[PDB]
Design a protein around this ligand. Structure first.
Ligand SMILES: [Zn+2]
Length: 140
């Protein structure tokens, strides 16, 4: 589990979105596994605005923060998980690392802020849904 709280936005994995999230929907994209909802309270998270490919992500299944190198956001085939069929996922970044389904929503950060959230796993890779292209999270 996990979310990004930027301004009056909450960013979650689309597959983990709640009724409240859908009742307060701003934007969602199945192909990216992202959903953004509106919040009453101001969040304090900063979205990274950069092309960094090194960062640190939180892995809840190991209670560890792992430094990782990660790929550029791309359209990648993802094998079946407990929450999606085998399919193409867009704006996805891969690293070598541990990811169980419960690790979805772990934050990946660099010196510039939040890069993305864990969205995929298996075959010894961890996949992160990028958020750095969503410049509208910074305003409104
Ligand atoms: Zn960065």
């Amino acid at each position: 589990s996990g979310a990004i709280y930027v301004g009056n936005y909450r960013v979650v994995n689309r597959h983990l979105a709640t009724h409240n999230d859908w009742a307060n929907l701003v934007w969602e994209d199945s192909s990216r596994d992202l959903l953004v909802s509106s919040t009453t309270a101001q969040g304090c998270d900063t979205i990274a605005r950069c092309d960094c490919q090194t960062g640190v992500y939180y892995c809840s299944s190991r209670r560890k923060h792992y430094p990782v190198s990660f790929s550029k956001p791309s359209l990648i085939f993802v094998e079946a998980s407990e929450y999606y069929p085998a399919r193409y996922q867009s704006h996805l970044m891969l690293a070598v690392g541990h990811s169980e389904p419960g690790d979805c929503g772990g934050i990946l950060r660099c010196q510039h802020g939040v890069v993305g959230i864990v969205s995929t796993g298996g075959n010894g890779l961890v996949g992160f849904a990028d958020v750095r292209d969503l410049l509208w999270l910074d305003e409104e």
